[PDB]
Coordinates of C-alpha atoms (C1' of nucleotides) and ligand atoms in Angstrom, one line a residue:
Chain A
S1 CA 18.7 -7.0 20.0
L2 CA 14.9 -6.8 19.4
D3 CA 14.0 -10.3 18.4
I4 CA 10.8 -10.9 16.5
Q5 CA 10.3 -14.6 16.3
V6 CA 7.6 -16.5 14.5
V7 CA 5.2 -19.2 15.9
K8 CA 3.6 -21.4 13.2
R9 CA -0.2 -21.2 13.4
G10 CA -1.6 -23.6 10.8
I11 CA -2.4 -24.8 7.3
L12 CA -5.4 -24.0 5.1
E13 CA -5.5 -26.5 2.2
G14 CA -7.7 -27.6 -0.6
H15 CA -6.6 -25.0 -3.2
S16 CA -5.8 -27.1 -6.3
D17 CA -3.0 -25.0 -7.8
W18 CA -1.5 -21.6 -6.7
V19 CA -2.8 -19.2 -4.1
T20 CA -2.9 -15.9 -6.0
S21 CA -5.0 -13.7 -3.7
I22 CA -6.0 -13.5 0.0
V23 CA -8.3 -11.2 1.9
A24 CA -9.1 -11.1 5.6
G25 CA -12.3 -9.7 7.2
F26 CA -12.7 -6.0 7.9
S27 CA -12.9 -5.1 11.5
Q28 CA -16.5 -4.3 12.0
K29 CA -16.9 -2.8 15.5
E30 CA -13.6 -1.3 16.3
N31 CA -10.6 -3.3 17.5
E32 CA -12.5 -6.6 17.2
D33 CA -11.1 -9.6 15.4
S34 CA -12.0 -10.8 11.8
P35 CA -13.7 -14.2 11.6
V36 CA -13.5 -14.2 7.8
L37 CA -11.0 -15.5 5.2
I38 CA -11.2 -15.6 1.4
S39 CA -8.6 -16.8 -1.0
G40 CA -8.4 -17.0 -4.8
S41 CA -6.0 -19.2 -6.7
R42 CA -5.4 -20.5 -10.2
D43 CA -7.5 -23.7 -9.8
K44 CA -10.5 -21.7 -11.1
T45 CA -11.8 -21.3 -7.5
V46 CA -12.6 -18.7 -4.7
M47 CA -12.3 -20.3 -1.3
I48 CA -14.3 -19.2 1.8
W49 CA -12.7 -20.4 5.0
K50 CA -14.2 -21.4 8.4
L51 CA -11.4 -20.8 10.9
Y52 CA -10.6 -22.9 14.0
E53 CA -10.3 -21.0 17.2
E54 CA -7.3 -22.9 18.5
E55 CA -5.2 -25.0 16.2
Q56 CA -6.3 -28.7 15.8
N57 CA -3.8 -31.1 14.4
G58 CA -1.5 -29.1 12.1
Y59 CA -4.4 -27.2 10.6
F60 CA -5.5 -23.6 11.2
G61 CA -9.0 -24.0 9.6
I62 CA -11.3 -25.7 7.1
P63 CA -12.8 -25.0 3.7
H64 CA -16.4 -23.7 3.9
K65 CA -17.6 -22.6 0.5
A66 CA -16.0 -23.0 -2.9
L67 CA -17.2 -20.3 -5.3
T68 CA -17.0 -21.6 -8.9
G69 CA -18.0 -19.2 -11.7
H70 CA -14.8 -19.0 -13.5
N71 CA -13.0 -20.4 -16.6
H72 CA -9.4 -19.2 -16.2
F73 CA -7.5 -18.3 -13.0
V74 CA -8.7 -16.0 -10.3
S75 CA -6.2 -13.2 -10.2
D76 CA -7.2 -10.9 -7.4
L77 CA -10.0 -10.5 -4.8
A78 CA -11.4 -7.5 -2.9
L79 CA -13.9 -7.2 -0.1
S80 CA -16.8 -4.9 0.4
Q81 CA -16.9 -2.9 3.6
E82 CA -19.9 -5.0 4.6
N83 CA -17.5 -8.1 4.4
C84 CA -20.7 -9.8 3.1
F85 CA -19.6 -9.3 -0.5
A86 CA -16.4 -10.3 -2.5
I87 CA -15.2 -9.7 -6.1
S88 CA -13.1 -11.8 -8.4
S89 CA -10.7 -10.8 -11.2
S90 CA -9.9 -13.4 -13.8
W91 CA -7.9 -14.2 -16.9
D92 CA -11.3 -15.3 -18.2
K93 CA -11.9 -11.6 -19.2
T94 CA -14.6 -11.3 -16.5
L95 CA -15.2 -9.9 -13.0
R96 CA -17.6 -11.4 -10.5
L97 CA -19.8 -10.1 -7.6
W98 CA -20.1 -12.8 -4.9
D99 CA -22.5 -13.0 -2.1
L100 CA -20.5 -14.4 0.8
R101 CA -23.3 -16.3 2.5
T102 CA -24.7 -18.0 -0.5
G103 CA -22.3 -19.3 -3.1
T104 CA -24.2 -17.1 -5.5
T105 CA -22.5 -14.7 -8.0
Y106 CA -24.6 -11.5 -8.0
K107 CA -23.7 -9.8 -11.2
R108 CA -20.7 -10.4 -13.4
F109 CA -18.7 -7.7 -15.2
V110 CA -18.3 -8.4 -18.9
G111 CA -16.7 -6.2 -21.5
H112 CA -13.1 -6.5 -20.6
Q113 CA -11.3 -8.0 -23.6
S114 CA -7.8 -9.5 -22.9
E115 CA -7.8 -10.5 -19.2
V116 CA -8.0 -9.1 -15.7
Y117 CA -5.1 -9.0 -13.2
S118 CA -6.5 -6.9 -10.4
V119 CA -9.6 -5.4 -8.8
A120 CA -10.2 -2.7 -6.2
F121 CA -13.2 -1.6 -4.3
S122 CA -13.9 2.0 -3.5
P123 CA -14.7 3.0 0.1
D124 CA -18.2 4.1 -0.9
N125 CA -18.7 0.6 -2.3
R126 CA -20.5 2.0 -5.3
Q127 CA -17.4 2.1 -7.5
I128 CA -15.5 -0.9 -8.9
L129 CA -12.0 -0.5 -10.4
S130 CA -10.6 -3.2 -12.8
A131 CA -7.3 -3.6 -14.7
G132 CA -5.6 -6.0 -17.0
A133 CA -3.5 -6.8 -20.1
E134 CA -5.5 -4.3 -22.1
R135 CA -3.4 -1.6 -20.6
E136 CA -6.7 -0.3 -19.2
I137 CA -8.4 0.7 -16.0
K138 CA -12.2 0.5 -15.9
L139 CA -14.8 2.0 -13.6
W140 CA -18.0 0.0 -13.0
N141 CA -21.4 0.5 -11.4
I142 CA -22.2 -2.2 -8.9
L143 CA -25.0 -3.0 -11.3
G144 CA -22.3 -4.2 -13.8
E145 CA -21.9 -1.3 -16.2
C146 CA -18.6 0.0 -17.5
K147 CA -18.7 3.7 -16.5
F148 CA -15.2 4.8 -17.6
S149 CA -12.0 3.6 -19.4
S150 CA -8.7 5.4 -19.0
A151 CA -7.3 6.4 -22.4
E152 CA -3.9 6.3 -24.2
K153 CA -2.7 9.7 -23.3
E154 CA -2.8 8.7 -19.6
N155 CA -2.7 4.9 -19.4
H156 CA 0.7 3.1 -19.4
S157 CA 2.5 0.7 -21.7
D158 CA 2.3 -3.1 -21.2
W159 CA 0.1 -4.5 -18.5
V160 CA -1.5 -3.0 -15.4
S161 CA -0.6 -5.6 -12.8
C162 CA -2.3 -4.0 -9.7
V163 CA -4.8 -1.2 -8.9
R164 CA -5.7 -0.1 -5.4
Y165 CA -7.3 2.7 -3.4
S166 CA -6.4 5.5 -1.0
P167 CA -8.1 4.9 2.4
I168 CA -10.0 7.8 4.0
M169 CA -10.2 7.0 7.6
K170 CA -13.4 7.2 9.6
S171 CA -12.9 10.2 11.9
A172 CA -12.0 13.5 10.2
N173 CA -9.6 13.8 13.2
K174 CA -7.4 11.2 11.6
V175 CA -5.6 13.9 9.5
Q176 CA -6.2 13.6 5.7
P177 CA -4.2 16.4 4.1
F178 CA -4.2 15.0 0.6
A179 CA -6.7 14.5 -2.2
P180 CA -8.2 11.1 -3.0
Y181 CA -6.3 9.0 -5.5
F182 CA -6.0 5.6 -6.9
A183 CA -2.8 3.8 -7.7
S184 CA -1.8 1.7 -10.7
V185 CA 1.4 -0.3 -11.0
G186 CA 2.6 -1.8 -14.3
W187 CA 5.0 -3.8 -16.4
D188 CA 6.6 -0.7 -17.8
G189 CA 7.8 -0.2 -14.2
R190 CA 5.6 2.9 -13.7
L191 CA 3.7 3.8 -10.6
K192 CA 0.7 6.0 -11.4
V193 CA -1.6 8.0 -9.1
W194 CA -4.8 9.3 -10.5
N195 CA -7.6 11.5 -9.2
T196 CA -11.2 10.4 -9.0
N197 CA -12.0 11.9 -12.4
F198 CA -9.4 9.6 -14.0
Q199 CA -6.9 12.4 -14.5
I200 CA -3.2 11.6 -14.1
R201 CA -2.0 13.2 -10.9
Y202 CA 1.5 11.7 -10.5
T203 CA 3.2 9.2 -12.8
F204 CA 6.7 8.2 -11.8
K205 CA 8.8 5.6 -13.5
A206 CA 9.5 3.5 -10.4
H207 CA 11.3 0.4 -11.6
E208 CA 13.6 -1.0 -14.2
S209 CA 11.8 -4.3 -14.9
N210 CA 8.2 -4.8 -14.1
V211 CA 6.0 -4.3 -11.1
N212 CA 3.9 -7.1 -9.7
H213 CA 2.2 -5.4 -6.7
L214 CA 1.4 -2.1 -4.9
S215 CA -0.1 -1.5 -1.5
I216 CA -1.0 1.7 0.5
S217 CA -0.3 2.3 4.2
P218 CA -3.5 2.4 6.3
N219 CA -2.7 6.1 6.7
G220 CA -2.6 6.6 3.0
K221 CA 0.6 8.5 3.6
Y222 CA 2.9 6.1 1.8
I223 CA 3.0 3.6 -1.0
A224 CA 4.9 0.2 -1.3
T225 CA 5.8 -1.0 -4.7
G226 CA 7.5 -4.2 -6.0
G227 CA 8.4 -6.6 -8.8
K228 CA 11.2 -8.4 -10.7
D229 CA 13.3 -5.3 -9.9
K230 CA 14.1 -7.2 -6.7
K231 CA 13.6 -3.9 -5.0
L232 CA 11.0 -2.7 -2.6
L233 CA 10.3 1.0 -3.1
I234 CA 8.5 3.1 -0.5
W235 CA 7.1 6.5 -1.6
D236 CA 6.1 9.6 0.3
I237 CA 3.1 11.3 -1.4
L238 CA 4.7 14.6 -0.3
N239 CA 8.2 14.4 -1.9
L240 CA 8.6 12.1 -4.9
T241 CA 11.8 13.1 -6.6
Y242 CA 13.6 10.5 -4.5
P243 CA 11.8 7.4 -3.2
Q244 CA 11.0 7.6 0.6
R245 CA 12.8 4.3 1.4
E246 CA 14.3 1.4 -0.4
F247 CA 14.8 -2.2 0.6
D248 CA 16.6 -5.2 -0.9
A249 CA 14.3 -8.2 -0.8
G250 CA 15.8 -11.4 -2.2
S251 CA 14.8 -12.3 -5.8
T252 CA 11.5 -11.4 -7.3
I253 CA 8.6 -9.5 -5.5
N254 CA 5.2 -11.2 -5.7
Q255 CA 3.2 -9.3 -3.1
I256 CA 3.4 -6.5 -0.6
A257 CA 1.2 -5.8 2.4
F258 CA 1.2 -3.1 5.2
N259 CA 0.5 -4.1 8.8
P260 CA -2.9 -2.4 9.3
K261 CA -1.5 -1.1 12.6
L262 CA 2.0 -2.3 13.4
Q263 CA 3.9 -0.2 10.8
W264 CA 5.8 -3.1 9.2
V265 CA 5.9 -4.2 5.6
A266 CA 5.5 -7.8 4.5
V267 CA 6.9 -8.9 1.1
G268 CA 5.9 -12.0 -0.8
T269 CA 8.9 -13.3 -2.8
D270 CA 9.9 -16.5 -4.6
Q271 CA 12.4 -17.3 -1.8
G272 CA 9.8 -16.6 0.8
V273 CA 8.2 -13.8 2.9
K274 CA 10.3 -11.0 4.4
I275 CA 9.1 -8.4 7.0
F276 CA 10.6 -4.9 7.3
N277 CA 10.6 -2.6 10.3
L278 CA 10.3 1.1 9.3
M279 CA 11.0 2.2 12.8
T280 CA 14.7 1.4 12.6
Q281 CA 17.0 1.4 9.6
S282 CA 18.1 -2.2 8.9
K283 CA 17.5 -4.4 5.9
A284 CA 16.0 -7.8 7.1
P285 CA 13.8 -7.8 10.3
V286 CA 12.0 -11.2 9.9
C287 CA 12.6 -13.8 7.2
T288 CA 10.4 -16.9 6.5
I289 CA 11.2 -19.6 3.9
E290 CA 8.9 -22.5 4.0
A291 CA 9.7 -26.2 3.4
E292 CA 7.0 -28.1 1.7
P293 CA 4.3 -30.2 3.4
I294 CA 3.7 -31.7 -0.1
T295 CA 7.4 -32.7 -0.1
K296 CA 6.5 -35.0 2.8
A297 CA 5.1 -37.2 0.1
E298 CA 7.8 -39.9 -0.1
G299 CA 10.6 -39.5 -2.6
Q300 CA 9.7 -36.1 -4.1
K301 CA 11.8 -33.2 -2.8
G302 CA 11.0 -29.6 -3.3
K303 CA 13.0 -26.5 -4.4
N304 CA 10.6 -24.8 -2.0
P305 CA 7.3 -23.3 -3.0
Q306 CA 7.2 -19.6 -3.8
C307 CA 4.5 -17.4 -2.1
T308 CA 1.9 -16.0 -4.5
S309 CA 0.0 -14.0 -1.9
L310 CA -0.2 -12.1 1.4
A311 CA -2.8 -10.8 3.8
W312 CA -3.0 -9.4 7.3
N313 CA -6.1 -9.9 9.5
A314 CA -7.7 -6.7 10.8
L315 CA -6.0 -6.8 14.2
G316 CA -2.6 -7.2 12.5
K317 CA -1.6 -10.1 14.7
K318 CA -2.0 -12.9 12.2
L319 CA -0.4 -13.2 8.7
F320 CA -1.4 -15.4 5.7
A321 CA 0.9 -16.4 2.9
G322 CA -0.5 -18.1 -0.2
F323 CA 1.8 -20.4 -2.1
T324 CA 2.9 -22.3 -5.2
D325 CA 1.7 -25.6 -3.7
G326 CA -1.9 -24.4 -3.1
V327 CA -1.4 -24.2 0.7
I328 CA -2.0 -21.1 2.7
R329 CA 0.2 -20.8 5.7
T330 CA -0.5 -18.9 8.9
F331 CA 2.0 -17.3 11.2
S332 CA 2.0 -15.3 14.5
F333 CA 4.7 -13.2 16.2
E334 CA 6.3 -13.3 19.6
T335 CA 8.6 -10.4 20.7
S336 CA 11.6 -11.0 22.8
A337 CA 13.3 -7.7 23.5
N338 CA 16.8 -7.7 25.1
Chain W
rC1 C1' -44.1 -44.9 -10.9
rA2 C1' -46.1 -43.0 -15.1
rG3 C1' -48.8 -39.5 -18.5
rG4 C1' -51.1 -34.2 -20.0
rU5 C1' -50.2 -29.2 -19.3
rU6 C1' -47.4 -24.4 -17.6
rG7 C1' -43.4 -20.1 -17.7
rU8 C1' -41.3 -12.3 -18.5
rA9 C1' -38.2 -19.9 -15.6
rC10 C1' -33.1 -22.7 -16.4
rU11 C1' -28.4 -25.0 -19.4
rU12 C1' -26.5 -30.5 -16.0
rC13 C1' -27.7 -33.6 -19.8
rU14 C1' -28.7 -32.1 -26.1
rU15 C1' -27.5 -29.2 -30.2
rA16 C1' -22.9 -25.7 -31.5
rG17 C1' -21.0 -20.9 -32.0
rA18 C1' -17.1 -17.5 -29.1
rG19 C1' -13.2 -18.2 -26.0
rG20 C1' -10.5 -21.0 -23.0
rG21 C1' -7.2 -25.7 -22.5
rA22 C1' -1.4 -29.1 -23.3
rC23 C1' 3.5 -26.7 -23.5
rU24 C1' 5.6 -33.3 -21.8
rA25 C1' 3.3 -29.0 -16.9
rU26 C1' 5.3 -29.8 -11.8
rU27 C1' 8.9 -32.4 -9.0
rG28 C1' 13.2 -35.6 -9.2
rU29 C1' 21.7 -35.7 -6.1
rG30 C1' 16.5 -41.0 -11.9
rC31 C1' 19.7 -42.1 -16.9
rA32 C1' 21.8 -39.0 -19.9
rA33 C1' 29.7 -36.7 -20.8
rU34 C1' 23.6 -32.3 -17.5
rA35 C1' 22.8 -30.9 -24.9
rA36 C1' 19.2 -32.6 -27.4
rG37 C1' 16.5 -36.0 -25.0
rC38 C1' 14.7 -40.4 -22.4
rC39 C1' 12.4 -42.2 -17.5
rA40 C1' 9.3 -42.2 -13.3
rA41 C1' 5.9 -40.2 -9.8
rU42 C1' 2.1 -36.4 -9.0
rG43 C1' -1.6 -33.2 -11.1
rG44 C1' -4.4 -33.3 -15.2
rA45 C1' -10.3 -34.2 -19.5
rA46 C1' -6.3 -35.4 -22.2
rG47 C1' 0.7 -36.6 -22.0
rU48 C1' 2.1 -43.2 -27.0
rU49 C1' 3.8 -36.8 -32.2
rU50 C1' -2.8 -36.4 -27.1
rA51 C1' -5.9 -40.3 -31.0
rA52 C1' -7.4 -41.3 -36.0
rG53 C1' -6.8 -39.1 -40.6
rG54 C1' -6.1 -35.2 -45.0
rC55 C1' -2.4 -33.1 -47.6
rA56 C1' 2.3 -35.2 -49.8
rA57 C1' 9.3 -32.7 -52.0
rU58 C1' 13.3 -34.4 -55.8
rA59 C1' 13.2 -38.4 -58.8
rA60 C1' 11.8 -42.1 -61.2
rC61 C1' 8.8 -47.3 -62.7
rA62 C1' 8.5 -47.0 -71.3
rG63 C1' 3.4 -49.3 -63.7
rG64 C1' -2.6 -48.5 -64.9
rU65 C1' -6.0 -46.1 -67.8
rC66 C1' -7.9 -44.7 -75.7
rU67 C1' -13.5 -49.1 -72.4
rG68 C1' -14.7 -42.4 -67.6
rU69 C1' -14.6 -38.0 -70.6
rG70 C1' -17.6 -33.5 -76.7
rA71 C1' -9.1 -34.5 -73.7
rU72 C1' -6.7 -36.1 -78.1
rG73 C1' -2.0 -37.9 -82.4
rC74 C1' -1.7 -42.0 -85.6
rC75 C1' -4.2 -46.8 -87.4
rC76 C1' -8.5 -49.2 -88.6
rC77 C1' -14.6 -50.0 -89.7
rU78 C1' -18.1 -46.7 -93.2
rA79 C1' -25.0 -49.3 -95.6
rG80 C1' -26.5 -57.1 -95.6
rA81 C1' -21.1 -50.9 -91.6
rC82 C1' -16.6 -52.0 -86.3
rG83 C1' -22.7 -46.6 -87.1
rU84 C1' -27.6 -46.4 -84.4
Ligands
LIG401 MG1 -0.5 -36.8 -37.2
LIG402 MG1 3.6 -52.5 -70.5

RNA sequence: CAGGUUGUACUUCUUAGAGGGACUAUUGUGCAAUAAGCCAAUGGAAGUUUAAGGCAAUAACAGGUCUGUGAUGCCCCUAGACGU
């Protein structure tokens, strides 16, 4: 057997409610570690984390700055390439541009109506993409001006849950055969793929229930898609009649993340976090349910927390799961190969 | 520590418009024949129907009001008038 076992790293706490979004630093000079962690939660707060080198006590790190601009929950965060800037989606019908050194909000994006579930940052950093319960995807100048809004003929029924982008690698030698696209996942169970011009390129009806999250392989060759359908769908951008691969992950799918290198898929689920190996065909490579540190409070027992977010650090060695109890948990992997 | 001034300044305090927010939320081998519900702890600005009120069905009670009304039936007073 190839055993992939998990060493517990630590605990990042001080998030009052849920942990809805997590981003880790971009690798700046190549193959070097990311010092930076940012989370977003219900709690009305965006947390900036100063991370311990080793692990002291049971903790992996300590809260540095708490960004407060927001009325309702923070749905999703995205980083600039600079790593010096972050953005916040919210149910408060607004987006925010955050300087990461100062607590300062730079500009805020206004003009969304209902509420905002997700945001994406384009590789050029001059385009912001935002989506919400308006069944609408919006394109913003970094100066805070709505540039475009996808219309009825294209846009999908119910709510856009998540929008993301299609990475173009640095070297041209990294083999980019396709066109640039952006992907939109929704509560109608539709995975959409649009060109830069906001023209529908490929819209497949992926799921039977609703889709909470979508992420793109670092290669931009495949898409991972998931929600209440209790199914993890992987799609080849070459042949779409049939989904590339499918996995059964217990109960409901909250989040999905690709290992920036390692070629695994981590899935946030109510039961816990599952990790899939794409290099072999088997259905459950590493499974983590987490008992509650808040349960250690005497007399109150948990049903377990459910994990509301995932992120990998740039090196792909560390993994962060945001939870129901407002605690981020950190885990590392040791390989024992028989 | 106090005044006086000031600005392509600002919203914590102050107005008060928009919109949030609480649904008994979360947890509970707590009581419930596990159903309505109650209870506790935690979080929470707020968990006594959040608090205090407005409105008030069917029916009555020959309740009160001709002295609130230029709403009136009938009765009475009409030039030393019960009129002004
Ligand atoms: Mg009342
Ligand atoms: Mg009488």
